[PDB]
């Protein structure tokens, strides 16, 4: 198989496929990635007809920046009859699959294809039996098998394939599932809530975002992202000189110091988590998440990135660049990871680790 999907926020076919042709490129991994405006996927066929199992073993899934998910594909099926809707899918996986470990019947993530997903919500649970029944699914869910993907991208017309668990999102269209709480203080909360989803392993939850860490949010006014720093049981300075919601006040886990993020220097040496979402150029963002880094101010971050109009994979890669440069500058060992999340538009979320010798 020598197609791989990648699913994408519609409208950024283009990054996206931008960077697939660039890093599996980088890798002789060669192709093409057609571009269908605003269809929500993109997809990357190899020249070499098995290379599409080759490129989602061994490149890392978490350095692609505009893909929520991906998955190899074979041959697409059209005009799948509504009298006969098992049987050739069931066809299209045996021997390519057996015992994989999960199933997930996915649509690319625009209004048009909004009733189609209710369709796929739901044909899942006769489709898994199916497929249990003809050995193409283990009769009992398992985390290290395969993923199994059926992918509509239209009324009777699907593709099959996987993706690995180890080198893949672990969300169903690659979205976490986040229901907007009414006492968070904006809706913005959910763009930090789906980078913690997506960015720290659900098994380190308890460790990485523990209970009575330090954390400062510059530019925390209101405080939608301060918000999901409290959920975790947090001790946060909210860095604005807007003020913020009472209900986080209340809490007593806040602490509101009326300055400009910007300007902002932590006196205190044990912060563990930095956050930002300030509306800026993301040169100058960019540059200020390294300092923090630099100086050892935080030990983890996440931050958004504002893309430009044009050349935004370009861009944002050499953002991330710049952090990057300061980091081997100072011989200071760190992890960067990003990702254009659901809740992100026209910007990026940056997730940093810094490690201490």
Request: proline share 6%; net charge neutral; with cysteine.
């Amino acid at each position: 198989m020598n197609k791989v999907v990648l699913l994408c926020r519609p409208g950024f076919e283009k990054e996206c496929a931008a960077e697939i042709t660039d890093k599996a490129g980088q890798r002789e991994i060669f192709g093409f990635a057609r571009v269908k405006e605003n269809a929500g996927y993109v997809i990357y066929e190899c020249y070499q007809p098995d290379d599409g199992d080759k490129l989602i073993r061994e490149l890392p899934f978490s350095s692609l920046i505009f893909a929520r998910q991906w998955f190899v594909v074979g041959e697409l099926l059209q005009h799948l009859p509504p009298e006969d809707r098992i049987t050739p899918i069931v066809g299209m996986l045996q021997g390519v699959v057996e015992k994989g470990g999960e199933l997930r019947v996915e649509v690319a993530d625009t209004n048009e294809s909004k009733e189609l997903l209710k369709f796929c919500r739901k044909f899942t649970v006769p489709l898994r039996a199916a497929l249990r029944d003809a050995g193409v699914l283990a009769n009992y869910e398992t985390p290290k098998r395969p993923v199994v993907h059926v992918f509509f991208i239209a009324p009777g017309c699907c593709y099959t394939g996987y993706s690995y668990s180890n080198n893949n999102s672990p969300f169903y269209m690659g979205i976490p599932r986040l229901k907007f709480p009414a006492d968070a203080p904006s809706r913005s909360t959910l763009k930090l809530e789906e980078a913690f989803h997506v960015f720290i392993p659900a098994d380190e939850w308890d460790e990485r975002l523990a209970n009575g860490m330090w954390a400062v949010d510059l530019g925390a006014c209101p405080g939608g992202w301060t918000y999901q720093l409290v959920k975790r049981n947090m001790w946060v300075y909210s860095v604005d000189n807007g003020p913020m919601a009472q209900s986080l006040m209340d809490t007593g886990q806040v602490t509101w110091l009326r300055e400009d993020g910007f300007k902002f220097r932590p006196t205190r040496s044990n912060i563990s988590w930095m956050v930002c979402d300030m509306v800026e150029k993301p040169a100058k963002v960019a540059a200020l998440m390294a300092q923090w880094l630099v100086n050892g101010w935080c030990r983890e971050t996440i931050f958004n990135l504002k893309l430009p109009m044009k050349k935004r994979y370009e861009e944002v890669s050499h953002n991330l660049a710049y952090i990057q440069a300061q980091l081997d500058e100072h011989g200071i060992n760190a992890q960067i990871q990003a990702r254009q999340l659901y809740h992100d538009r026209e910007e990026v979320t940056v997730h940093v680790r810094r490690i201490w010798a």
